Design a protein around this ligand. Sequence first.
Ligand SMILES: Nc1ncnc2c1ncn2[C@@H]1O[C@H](COP(=O)(O)OP(=O)(O)OP(=O)(O)O)[C@@H](O)[C@H]1O
Ligand SMILES: Nc1ncnc2c1ncn2[C@@H]1O[C@H](COP(=O)(O)OP(=O)(O)OP(=O)(O)O)[C@@H](O)[C@H]1O
Ligand SMILES: Nc1ncnc2c1ncn2[C@@H]1O[C@H](COP(=O)(O)OP(=O)(O)OP(=O)(O)O)[C@@H](O)[C@H]1O
Ligand SMILES: Nc1ncnc2c1ncn2[C@@H]1O[C@H](COP(=O)(O)OP(=O)(O)OP(=O)(O)O)[C@@H](O)[C@H]1O
Ligand SMILES: Nc1ncnc2c1ncn2[C@@H]1O[C@H](COP(=O)(O)OP(=O)(O)OP(=O)(O)O)[C@@H](O)[C@H]1O
Ligand SMILES: Nc1ncnc2c1ncn2[C@@H]1O[C@H](COP(=O)(O)OP(=O)(O)OP(=O)(O)O)[C@@H](O)[C@H]1O
Ligand SMILES: [Mg+2]
Ligand SMILES: [Mg+2]
Ligand SMILES: [Mg+2]
Ligand SMILES: [Mg+2]
Ligand SMILES: [Mg+2]
Ligand SMILES: [Mg+2]
Lengths: 247, 247, 247, 247, 247, 247
Amino acid sequence: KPAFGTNQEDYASYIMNGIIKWGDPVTRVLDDGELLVQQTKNSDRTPLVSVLLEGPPHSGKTALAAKIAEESNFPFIKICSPDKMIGFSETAKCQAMKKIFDDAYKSQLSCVVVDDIERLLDYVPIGPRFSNLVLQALLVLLKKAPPQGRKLLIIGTTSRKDVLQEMEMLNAFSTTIHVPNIATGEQLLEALELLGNFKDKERTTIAQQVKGKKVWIGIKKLLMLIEMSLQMDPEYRVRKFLALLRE
Amino acid sequence: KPAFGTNQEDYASYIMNGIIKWGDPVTRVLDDGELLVQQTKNSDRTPLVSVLLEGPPHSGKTALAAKIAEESNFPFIKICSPDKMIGFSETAKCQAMKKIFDDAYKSQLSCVVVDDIERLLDYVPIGPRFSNLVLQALLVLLKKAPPQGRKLLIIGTTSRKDVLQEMEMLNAFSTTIHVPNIATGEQLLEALELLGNFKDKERTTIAQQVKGKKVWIGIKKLLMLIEMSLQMDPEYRVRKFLALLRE
Amino acid sequence: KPAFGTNQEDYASYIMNGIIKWGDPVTRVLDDGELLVQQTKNSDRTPLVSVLLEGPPHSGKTALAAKIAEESNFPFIKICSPDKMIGFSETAKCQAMKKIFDDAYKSQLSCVVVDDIERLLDYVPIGPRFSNLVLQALLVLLKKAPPQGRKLLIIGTTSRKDVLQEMEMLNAFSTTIHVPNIATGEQLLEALELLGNFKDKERTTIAQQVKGKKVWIGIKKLLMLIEMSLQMDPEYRVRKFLALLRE
Amino acid sequence: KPAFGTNQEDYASYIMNGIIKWGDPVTRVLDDGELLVQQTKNSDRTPLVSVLLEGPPHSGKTALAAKIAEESNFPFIKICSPDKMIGFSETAKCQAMKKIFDDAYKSQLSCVVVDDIERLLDYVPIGPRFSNLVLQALLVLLKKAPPQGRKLLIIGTTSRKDVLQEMEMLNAFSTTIHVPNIATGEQLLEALELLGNFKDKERTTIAQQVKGKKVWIGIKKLLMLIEMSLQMDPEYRVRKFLALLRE
Amino acid sequence: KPAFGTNQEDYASYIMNGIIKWGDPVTRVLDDGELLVQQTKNSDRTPLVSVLLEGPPHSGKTALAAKIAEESNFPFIKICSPDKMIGFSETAKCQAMKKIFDDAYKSQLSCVVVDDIERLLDYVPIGPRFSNLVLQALLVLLKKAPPQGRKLLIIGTTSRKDVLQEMEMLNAFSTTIHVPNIATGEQLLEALELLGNFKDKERTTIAQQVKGKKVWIGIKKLLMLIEMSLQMDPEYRVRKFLALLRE
Amino acid sequence: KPAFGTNQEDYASYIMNGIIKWGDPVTRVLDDGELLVQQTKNSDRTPLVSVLLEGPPHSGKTALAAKIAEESNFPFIKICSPDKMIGFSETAKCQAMKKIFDDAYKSQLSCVVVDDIERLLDYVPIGPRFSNLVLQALLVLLKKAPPQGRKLLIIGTTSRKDVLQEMEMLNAFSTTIHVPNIATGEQLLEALELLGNFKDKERTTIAQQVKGKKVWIGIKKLLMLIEMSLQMDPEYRVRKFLALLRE
Ligand SMILES: Nc1ncnc2c1ncn2[C@@H]1O[C@H](COP(=O)(O)OP(=O)(O)OP(=O)(O)O)[C@@H](O)[C@H]1O
Ligand SMILES: Nc1ncnc2c1ncn2[C@@H]1O[C@H](COP(=O)(O)OP(=O)(O)OP(=O)(O)O)[C@@H](O)[C@H]1O
Ligand SMILES: Nc1ncnc2c1ncn2[C@@H]1O[C@H](COP(=O)(O)OP(=O)(O)OP(=O)(O)O)[C@@H](O)[C@H]1O
Ligand SMILES: Nc1ncnc2c1ncn2[C@@H]1O[C@H](COP(=O)(O)OP(=O)(O)OP(=O)(O)O)[C@@H](O)[C@H]1O
Ligand SMILES: Nc1ncnc2c1ncn2[C@@H]1O[C@H](COP(=O)(O)OP(=O)(O)OP(=O)(O)O)[C@@H](O)[C@H]1O
Ligand SMILES: Nc1ncnc2c1ncn2[C@@H]1O[C@H](COP(=O)(O)OP(=O)(O)OP(=O)(O)O)[C@@H](O)[C@H]1O
Ligand SMILES: [Mg+2]
Ligand SMILES: [Mg+2]
Ligand SMILES: [Mg+2]
Ligand SMILES: [Mg+2]
Ligand SMILES: [Mg+2]
Ligand SMILES: [Mg+2]
């Protein structure tokens, strides 16, 4: 248990492979986040600010949300994660979630990350089915101002903005930030360079196949394809990589 | 615990940014509310009066309901809010809600605000799903006259009048008051002036873009767009504001 | 707790604004009710008699049912009302309802009013949803003869005859009595006169606008429109009344 | 608690207005019932026999089932009625129902009446909804032979043969007996005569209006219409009767 | 409680009217069953063998399954029947069912009959509705090999092969055996002869009406029609029989 | 209970009839599995690797998953199987499943097999119905990295890749490996040879009927058809085999 009104998060587990600048959108996400941190800390009109980072799966939403939170330097920073509520009933999740906000309210400046909203709400498109009790708790928490004078920045992440819109959750968030997949051959080459896994000859081959072209892959997904490619004999790593990227 | 048959609400949390007269509808809402307060206090025929303030999200329904209640000067004034029932089961909400009315009945003149009906009922359009037990309790409470001779003004708020109509709740309310978003450039300029955030040169620029035109934004939403605009460098505040207002 | 096999109801709360003879249907309802009371008390063939008073909302069903019951002069008269089962689970309602009939069976002559069937059954058209356990208990209670020799008149009220028909409840009731809204300008003028709220000049103005015409408003609703009209300056009371009546 | 393996039912409550021979179908129902009683008592091949008496509501199903049971003269005769399970959960009903059969199995010759199957199963056409646990218990009980050598006649009644067919319950019953409403003016006149409520002049008038014609009314329903007619002044009893019969 | 790893079933209750050879399919069912018993006892590759006996209702599935089991002469033979789980919750059924298999696993050679799968699963076509917990337990039990070296023959019965297929249960059974209704006049005459209920003159009459023709009736159903026919006066037994067989 | 951070599985029960090389796909499955084991043990970027083995029912998914796990030689190897959760409620399954991963996290190198996902999730296509609580727990567990520095290979198996895709589970798995049924006469002949059940003359006959042709049968299913064929008289084994294979 941390000091009263404080909390230091373990960003290592949420950003295990860093934050590489593979393209302009990465900088845009971080800059927009810092502006929201600025607004939260300095505003009396809007002491409660919430933002939803959303994009396709594996695009890097969680790590970016954790980075924005980390850069806020707020006394209280906590990440509400589903991997800490495995098997939890609706009530159990609401109590756990409510506890986090209760502790946040004790700090003058706090930031709470509500990560992977779809999992927190136990959503599944078949039906669909989901925990309405948890959804309702979240809709209220997103609009509950901390006690007078104290500020709170809520950062949510999701790969299903569409579902959250149907649930009326978008009306609860102050704004949203799109977290895109790598979309161009250039951005893809930049990522590979910053990650440094292939030799120039290999990157050249890849480049010939992707430069000036369009791709669609999340940074987290790219990490896996690379690692799978590296298990091949040196002479087949590139072939494997392009094949995986292809299908 | 307050004195028997009494209760003083903390209006500061429900009206954190005041009540500015950005347009005629604001005065209309307050005046209609005072007439209902008058009817409640003076009538023997209709000792129970209920009104639903409804309009688009962020239009200022809660603050206006809290203001009408505050201006009643009734001995007992209580706001039934969902942010005090987070994670609550249907039964728990009904008991909490029933307690409030029970205490209200102890006063000769009382006013109860049932705020954000959609959240109180755990409503979600997917399904849809909602707490019928809570809906039923509310339908009965809306028609239950306080013990003989005592008066009660019930003020509800909602951003989903359509849903409440389907639930037959409109037949329970005595009347309804529409709470509109700011709808004209003039009303928008008036709001900015009363809030005093931009310089004349800036308001002039904005005016050139909105005067004699139509807009659609809730006062609560406007506060957020302004505050977000203020984080920009002086030379780009207006550009940001119009862009946000645009999309 | 009342004397064994007895119960005196508090008709004041169910008939707070009397029973005015605004039109022939009021007399028809009371007369049909007295005939059913007569049949119940005098018949050996049909010792159990049930009747459903139904009509549009606010038409005066409850007060009329309470009046019919009151005029029976039976030793045991009890009104089963939803405002005494707020927040109740299905089981809780069935037990409460079953208790009332159990006590009624102890009297030689009893009358039980099952008021606002839709609320007792927790009905909502979305779904729809309702308490089947309560519906089933009611279907059985409506056909359960008191112990040999004893009589029971069951009077139900509802604003949703259509729903009850779908639920097969109409096959349970012995007969039904329609409780209509005020339907003609004449009946409307008669009501205003018997209630005595407007001056002759005013009633004359209203008459010019409604006499020889058709209207559709429940007596309970009319009381509210009048009371709202009375909050206006003398010179605008009539204008307000007709406007409210209009929309 | 009755003697081991025995049970005497109170037929008075299930046949409060006797069994009048208003038409051939009444005799047909009783005769078919006695044949099934005969088969049950004398057969080694089919020691378990079940029959469903079904027809429109109010046609006299329960009283006829109770009469067939009474005429069996079996040591154990028990009527499983829903008015003894008001408010019961599915489990509670199954236990109560299972208890009855358990006691029946203790007798060499037993007869169990499962009355008003729709109510026992908590059926409602909206949905529809019903207690599947109770349905399943009944489907199994209908096919469970008493312990070797002992006989059991199960008599069910229902006004919804169609619903029971959908539930596959008809495959469980050995056979079914139709219990029709009074269908001809002759049968109607015979009923009135056997009940002796109108004077010859009156029956003559009625006859002129119904003889050689077709009608459709259950004996239980007829009893109520007559009794309602008898509340009128002598000169209007017939008019009332035909009017009620008409609509 | 029987000896460890053993269990002797009471086949009398499951085969109360024997196993008559009314036609070739009866022999086919028994022969196929003995081959499966042979495979189970002798195979190391498939120590777990399951078979579903299925056909129309009343065709004799249970008695035939009980006969196949009886003829296996296995040390452990147990019939899992729904008439021993009346009113049972899903969990209760799974525990009871799991207990049986647990005991079977203790024997070197065991046979478990899972009778009337539709009832075990609380199936009803309206909805439909059924116990998924029980279905899941059965799907797993059908594929769980007894502890190494021990054998188990599972025999299921059902009148709804179609439903079980939709539930994916057919992929769980090793094979299926069809249990048909009596289908020809010849088979029908053979049954009557083996049961010996009618006189030659009578069988001759029946023969004239059914020989060289097609019929469709389950042996269990035939037993009931015969027994019902025998309640008639000698001169009308045949007439009754053909009438019943007709409709 | 095994040593801290360790666990040795009993592969005998999951691979009771070995792993025969009936065709190239068998080698492909094992080779792809070893590459994933290699990646898991050697990578710092992707310390958590998950793979779904999927294909038609009876194709050999479980045994192959168990073989891949066995060949990893990891200190901790555990198979999460539904036959150890029979009758389990959603919560019970989640706790049991969560326990396994918790123990796995204690090892530097672990492999967890989540076998037969459809059964673990209590899936049934009618509805459909399934345990969402279990699905949600699995979606989170599939993405939860073991504590820093430790590796985990998760291997799932399913016969319903389509259902898992709808449930969004495919986005959770790192990759998938298809486990096909035997598809050619050649592969079928190879299987029979490796299993050694028929004589050359017999295999020759079969070959004449299947060589250069296409078939579709899972290895587990083939084992059963063979064993059933072996119960026939020597002269009819082949006839039986082809007949079974045919339909
Ligand atoms: N610019 C970047 N933005 C985000 N993540 C990055 C970046 N550069 C490297 N990474 C690494 O990529 C991974 C991103 O995975 P993360 O779990 O954040 O994705 P996600 O979109 O939240 O996934 P999911 O859709 O599964 O929720 C982390 O290992 C992170 O350190
Ligand atoms: N004229 C006004 N009417 C209402 N609110 C006003 C007005 N002028 C300023 N405000 C401020 O705007 C905010 C209105 O937000 P409020 O929560 O009342 O809106 P709402 O419509 O109830 O929101 P929601 O749709 O989220 O329920 C408060 O901060 C309030 O003080
Ligand atoms: N003739 C009348 N019949 C009925 N009520 C009357 C009559 N004259 C005056 N009233 C008054 O009108 C009101 C009728 O309201 P009541 O609650 O009975 O209506 P309702 O139709 O039962 O309402 P709801 O639809 O809300 O259930 C009572 O205050 C009653 O005293
Ligand atoms: N021939 C008859 N058959 C049946 N009931 C008769 C007959 N003659 C008179 N009665 C009387 O009519 C009434 C029949 O009502 P009963 O409750 O048996 O009908 P039901 O069809 O079971 O009703 P429900 O549809 O409500 O279940 C009883 O009072 C019974 O004594
Ligand atoms: N050849 C036969 N096969 C099966 N049952 C026979 C045969 N000959 C006589 N019988 C008798 O017929 C009856 C068959 O009924 P059983 O309960 O087995 O049928 P079922 O198809 O299982 O019924 P249900 O569809 O109700 O489950 C038993 O009394 C049995 O002894
Ligand atoms: N090459 C092989 N691959 C897989 N199983 C094999 C192979 N050769 C022989 N077998 C044997 O075939 C059986 C395969 O059955 P298994 O339970 O693994 O199949 P499955 O596809 O998982 O079944 P289900 O669809 O029922 O889940 C085992 O007995 C296994 O030892
Ligand atoms: Mg994420
Ligand atoms: Mg509000
Ligand atoms: Mg009423
Ligand atoms: Mg009946
Ligand atoms: Mg059977
Ligand atoms: Mg498997």
